[PDB]
Write a protein that binds this ligand. Structure first.
Ligand SMILES: Cc1ncc(COP(=O)(O)O)c(CN)c1O
Ligand SMILES: Cc1ncc(COP(=O)(O)O)c(CN)c1O
Lengths: 354, 354
């Protein structure tokens, strides 16, 4: 007898779904585990046309984002979060069972999940001790690679990748692979974006999202910025109607000139709060080291991190365990929330210190 | 020199994106080309939690739909329309370059588009003259097939597939392939659903949507109904956060007991309007034949169909040309809208008749 499971693809049977979830509804009161902006920003629907299909690429959203990002509208694609952008790039450039993607741990886990699910080889070149790119390592492992993902600023470590090294990576991949700069957190350090480099690199693509600084993770709205040739290829593999009208409606509102002003205020707010938390953490006994951050989260190494994580977890303070990540033994990632939430973390940590 | 296009997958370079679009903004006043409910049903957001990520599978949506469909919650998956359900099935059961899908033209075009884009062989077995399944043909072309798609009622022809033949198809595929009954239009003939057959067939999957009878195409919300084993496999390949909160919010509202009552009223409305249009069309000179329908659209063969289509198009009456579809020479698909819209069609057609 043949089971339904026997009919599934081998890679699908053996893969482990992305570990995003880690809930405890009505149990935790302080959520600093998903890099979400801490407070809700309200939006209401303005377009009651739900009986009709939306545009594949809502014009107002594309144009408002292009204006905001400083790129041409033809260089923008909107999708269901940066997560879908990751998928589209593999779907368009990586032949299953032939081509591979390359990423550098420790970093965002969806690059690997998407490739493994689609059936594309995952090539890894761990970053250096300070999490900067191992350029020599990458240079000798590019055969068969079609897409390279580099998160900058990096999640979960928090630092920016030296642009001088992005220059090198872009040269190494010229005429060989698409370089994807994941800028999910670039709003917190806008001057470091590679968006203005498009005219120099035909193979450069950039991932953006409304889930973090924009405080709209619930909208599942992201973008890919690239030269027209790349955008048009991605448009050949995207679903016909990837964005719902309610999302196009509210996303456009959030990207209005006033919306941008508000987003920048949110960034300033988070940066000021981040610096408070960083300074405070460094003084806590159970904290061994706090790593520099250019995002809305902080990576810190703790003494008995698993004990600390479980202790805060039971207290309703939900963080993100990084102990199993390469090079991140003893590290926990703390999202920057409100001052009160930072104080909850600080006070709880001071309660450990053995 | 290597171009960006040279880096794209061969199948991606050669494929032709799905032909959904056919717009003429502010030019057409009567839209009967996408099988959308003709009037907007208003919904407002009730959950201002947009800064937080949604659940992968919003509980209220899953439970409300399960209740409505008469199946167990564990037998339901929610996605970005039935379009994504089509994708998930290929993604979970079809190994690119090894396995194939099978469908029977003329039918919905996304089965082929998804398979071709992913890189899975498309096996076709045209339906018979009356668009019923060519069972003998299918029986001899199942080698390597992992997923079979059958739209019932069928788009664009409008008729139901004889359940006696679904029984045969299910036996032919037992322990070999997943049979997917596309029930995007089952709300118009609910008694014909195969949802109650799940306990008898481990390999049966059903596609459902909120885009038609539910009048919520703008929400991009669909479902897949199947036995738990199948649902769980599909859940291994779906994106971590496939549904936005605004959509989960409003979809749940539309699936409330009162929402179901309203949907059924919409169905009754459309059926009554459909019968009016069918009866009227048959009498028009330029109409050669009107085919039976159990949906919210009517397929009809016309004399000089291309002339008729262009004529109405220029008059602001937008239909869906089927002239290029196998066996559908001279046919146009007319969505059932309001009485006024049906009259516009009837009056325009009577203006031809040469
Ligand atoms: C580095 C990184 N990239 C991309 C994403 C996805 O962003 P999205 O909510 O637009 O699908 C995330 C969200 N955790 C992320 O951390
Ligand atoms: C037969 C059929 N199946 C599936 C779909 C997709 O439905 P959705 O708007 O839920 O992605 C459609 C929409 N035209 C359809 O006609």
């Amino acid at each position: 007898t043949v089971t339904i499971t026997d009919l599934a693809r081998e890679n699908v049977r053996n893969l482990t779904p992305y570990q995003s979830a880690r809930r405890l509804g009505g149990n935790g009161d302080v959520w600093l585990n998903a890099n979400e902006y801490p407070t809700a920003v309200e939006f209401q629907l303005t377009q009651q046309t739900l009986n009709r299909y939306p545009e594949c690429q809502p014009k107002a959203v594309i144009e408002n984002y292009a204006q905001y990002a400083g790129v041409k509208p033809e260089q923008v694609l909107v999708s269901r979060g940066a997560d879908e952008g990751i998928e589209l790039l593999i779907r368009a450039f990586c032949e299953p069972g032939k081509d591979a993607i390359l990423y550098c741990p420790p970093t965002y886990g969806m690059y690997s999940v998407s490739a493994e699910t689609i059936g594309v080889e995952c090539r890894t070149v761990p970053t250096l001790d300070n999490w900067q790119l191992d350029l020599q390592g990458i240079s000798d492992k590019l055969d068969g690679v079609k897409v390279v993902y580099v998160c900058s600023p990096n999640n979960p470590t928090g630092q920016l990748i030296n642009p001088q090294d992005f220059r090198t990576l872009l040269e190494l991949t010229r005429g060989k692979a698409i370089v994807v700069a994941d800028e999910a957190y670039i709003e917190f350090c806008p001057q470091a974006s590679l968006a203005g480099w498009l005219a120099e690199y035909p193979h450069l693509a950039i991932l953006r999202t409304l889930s973090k600084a924009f405080a709209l993770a619930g909208l599942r709205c992201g973008f890919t910025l690239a030269n027209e040739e790349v955008i048009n290829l991605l448009m050949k593999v995207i679903a016909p109607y990837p964005l719902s009208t309610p999302v196009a409606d509210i996303a456009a509102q959030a990207l209005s000139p006033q919306g941008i002003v508000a987003m920048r205020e949110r960034v300033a707010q988070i940066i000021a709060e981040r610096e408070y938390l960083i300074a405070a953490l460094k003084e806590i006994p159970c904290v061994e080291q706090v790593f520099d951050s250019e995002t809305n989260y902080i990576l810190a190494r703790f003494k008995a991190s698993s004990a600390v994580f479980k202790s805060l977890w039971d207290q309703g303070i939900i963080l993100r365990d990084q102990n199993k990540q390469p090079s991140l033994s003893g590290c926990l990632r703390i999202t920057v929330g409100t001052r009160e939430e930072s104080q909850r973390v600080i006070d709880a940590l001071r309660a450990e210190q053995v």
